[PDB]
């Protein structure tokens, strides 16, 4: 799809070394009787220890990755019910970005961490074409947008579009949607239309078509005839 990228892989050592000095007791000292409730900890499918207070551990790594010291490719999944915490720095994973919903507010409810302020700071940079250089990266380092792989995706609850879904609580020609009954969103999609690849991003109103019809055009358009390069 358009937004999706693919990890290049990093070194797991810093994370492990970090995990050690944050409560992960090594495996050699593990005795399931005394630690009936510990959480296993994996790093690329290597059991590395257990942890006894993983909830505090998780949210530490997250902000440590939202700060930008854990390279944001890195996926970290806490599987509460299986008592497991998994981390991959593996190369080759497929991931896409998402807005972070912080259920924090003086507004007293959840809302995206990115506001008109940053939007302005962005459009200022595009129309630069005097430097404050708000780029994509700044949205990363400020903990506004996260990469999410497909495994980590299991443990989030994405909102579909901010407006229609974050604030709590009609044209009959308009299509019919359902509600924000879910109150625990932890992410919002940047734009739902970004689930389409390149070829299908040229169909107009692909949501008014029969599905195979979009597969056809998406394969014909490759044998249209245009200008292929200006030179």
């Amino acid at each position: 799809s358009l937004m999706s990228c693919i990890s290049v892989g990093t070194d797991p050592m810093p994370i492990i070394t970090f995990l050690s000095e944050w409560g992960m007791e090594p495996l050699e000292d593990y005795v399931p009787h005394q630690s009936p409730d510990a959480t296993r900890v994996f790093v690329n499918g290597v059991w590395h220890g257990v942890h006894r207070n993983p909830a505090r551990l998780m949210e530490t790594l997250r902000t440590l990755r939202r700060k930008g010291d854990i390279n944001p490719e890195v996926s970290m999944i806490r599987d509460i019910r299986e008592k497991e915490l998994k981390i991959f720095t593996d190369a080759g994973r497929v991931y896409r970005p998402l807005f972070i919903v912080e259920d924090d507010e003086s507004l007293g409810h959840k809302e995206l961490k990115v506001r008109k302020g940053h939007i302005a700071k962005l459009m200022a940079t595009e129309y630069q074409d005097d430097v404050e250089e708000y780029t994509w990266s700044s949205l990363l380092n400020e903990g506004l947008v996260e990469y999410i792989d497909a495994e980590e995706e299991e443990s989030i609850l994405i909102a579909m579009q901010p407006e229609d879904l974050e604030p709590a609580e009609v044209d009959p020609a308009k299509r019919i949607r359902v509600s924000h009954h879910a109150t625990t969103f932890t992410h919002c999609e940047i734009h739902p239309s970004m689930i389409l690849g390149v070829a299908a991003s040229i169909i107009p109103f692909p949501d008014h078509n029969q599905s195979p019809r979009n597969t056809y055009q998406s394969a014909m358009g490759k044998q249209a005839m245009g200008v292929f390069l200006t030179n």
Partner: protein, 56 residues
């Protein structure tokens, strides 16, 4: 889909497209419909290879 909470058997959760091609499909419906639509393509591919061998 990761847009739903768990154990959600409502019609729109398990794949009931409700709008009409005129009104447009919401992004989930779109994806469920595309999932059903792909299964149609594969069958066609299969149903003609296996037909072709039978008839010969």
């Amino acid at each position: 889909l990761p847009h739903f909470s768990k154990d959600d058997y409502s019609p729109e959760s398990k794949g009931f497209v409700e709008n009409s091609y005129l009104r447009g499909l919401t992004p989930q419906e779109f994806f469920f419909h595309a999932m059903g639509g792909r299964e149609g393509l594969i069958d066609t591919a299969v149903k003609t290879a296996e037909t072709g061998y039978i008839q010969r």
